[PDB]
Amino acid sequence: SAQPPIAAKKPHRVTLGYVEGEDRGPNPMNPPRYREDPYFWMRDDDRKDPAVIEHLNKEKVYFQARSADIAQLRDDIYAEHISHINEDDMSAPYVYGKYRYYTREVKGKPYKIYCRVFTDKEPGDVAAEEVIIDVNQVAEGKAFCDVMEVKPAPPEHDLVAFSVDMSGNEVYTIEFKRISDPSQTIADKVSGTNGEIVWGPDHTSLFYVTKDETLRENKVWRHVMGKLQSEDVCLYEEHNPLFSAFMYKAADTNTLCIGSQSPETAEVHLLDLRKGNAHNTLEIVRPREKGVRYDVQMHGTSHLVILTNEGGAVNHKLLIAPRGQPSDWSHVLVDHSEDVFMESIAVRSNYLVVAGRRAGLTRIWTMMADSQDGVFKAGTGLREVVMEEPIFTVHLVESQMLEYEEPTFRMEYSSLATPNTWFDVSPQDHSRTAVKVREVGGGFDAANYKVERRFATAPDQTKIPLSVVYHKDLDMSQPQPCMLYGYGSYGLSMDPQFSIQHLPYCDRGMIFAIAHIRGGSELGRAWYEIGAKYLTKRNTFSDFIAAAEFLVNAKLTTPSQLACEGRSAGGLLMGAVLNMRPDLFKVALAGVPFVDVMTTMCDPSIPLTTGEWEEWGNPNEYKYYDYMLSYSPMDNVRAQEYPNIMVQCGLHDPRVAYWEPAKWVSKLRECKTDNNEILLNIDMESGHFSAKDRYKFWKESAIQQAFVCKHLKSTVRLLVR
């Protein structure tokens, strides 16, 4: 019965090219081009306009009415998600100072509890445990509560700072508490931050990063405890909108790294933390050079271990520069390779560890420092951590590696049907000890599922890997329903890693597949930097289509049985493939989807735009205008049949503005020639990542699986058929 809302149109001309008074980049088209955008009014930067809120509410009513018939299936799947998590749970503990730190979840509570015990006691022992921050108490009375960081102050770890965002726009307030005096109110508040907290050398001061009015991180500051924030001193400002500011502490705690990064270019400065709480003088590592990226990990205070793409090192090389001449890049530790992509590096007192990829999969490599002098030597070489399985994902868990002299590192391992395990690993002999194994209940068993690697062929004949998982009892003699996932931007690879999100699909007799399309870095950095960005970006979409065509041509599924999903830049993928090949899919999920590509990317007042001129290109420029227009999902909506679609988004999302999916759903409904349903679920209480409250998050997830399973006619679990 329920009818979708009809969106009003208001004339609005969008300018792409030169606009007097705005920074549209160094070479904007003049005269500029104009485009009509009759749904432009859906945008309100203040998220308070009565007509905009009314329209979003009418979308919400329509979504609730069309979803009423899948309430029971949503409840079933939500119960499955609940059975696949642990009401009472503890993270993998790690040592920092005199303590082992960890989080707990407790039955019936939606948020985490940050805890510790002394290193001579058992994590989770109630008689030994100290609660640092109970996020459930922080979130009292609030609809949404993201506590991002909790950092005890050295040397005592008694004073604690924590960052909290109560709306989802990822602007955080830093607050404080004293563990040894839980009723002492500490007056200091630091507002307008990106949520990162880095203490100074002692408990008297800390560093933090603020955002401009387009939410770009642009300044690094020092706050001295007991002062007003208006007395804080700005240590660094990045005025160029392509670049964001960042900061982190060296692993031995002696140096703060502060700098700027844009997709093409990095610049790092060092701040010595050994010269008291008034030393604010920065030391440049290497002045910015367009197209040169680098990362600095200090080995003590004397040497910079630098991971960089300089001088054609597409897959990156590792070098060591002296503190005293940090732009002397002549000493190569590990040269570039065509097969090994080095993605990040953790340096500790007598070893380093590199996370990256080789032969399509994540790998870890280690290198010991020379035992005679403690120095890294090029003749030693990287030693790969050898892993037995053909398909898996491994991560280096630097957030659980705090002690600079700790003789192990923390690695987490999973696969599509194998729950995560966290190990302490020796970099000397690669021996390991499991610290935590994720328990998954509700009858889950890893041996119920078959995991495979298959290969699609794109138009240019490149082989596109797919990671596939399905239930062992699924009848593979005929085509079956299937869900095909992609992302494909920023060089973020999708990996065959464990998630409970595909269990309701595989347990109902669906195939779950990931398409490892160009735009990720799965086959090395070129898979992104050349495979799909700027004027090759269209490869993301045609690789995904080749993956879908592969699953159909191989008789794994059929278009009537095929779903596709993606979120954020994966929602750009969904919007483009929905215009290009809607005939391949019965149903689609587009989460928080980047779809308003021309109107958003011409406009530097929208968060993220200016930095993404170095991802897709800048449509104010002749070089990019036609090419971006050729795939922009909003601008290629047309009179054809589309699949059933569900779109999830957040009113406060600071990465993909709520108005992009609102305008896109309106245009789809206006132009489409089929009688399928398009549902827009706008969460007025969150940002880009749905609820941090775990029960709300799992209920939000369940509505999406229920909608796919309904439209695939695969609603009944295999076990109970």
Binding site: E217, S244, S489, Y490, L492, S568, A569, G571, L572, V592, F594, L608, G611, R655, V656
Partner: peptide, 4 residues
């Protein structure tokens, strides 16, 4: 990791 400022992505969509």
């Amino acid at each position: 990791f400022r992505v969509r």
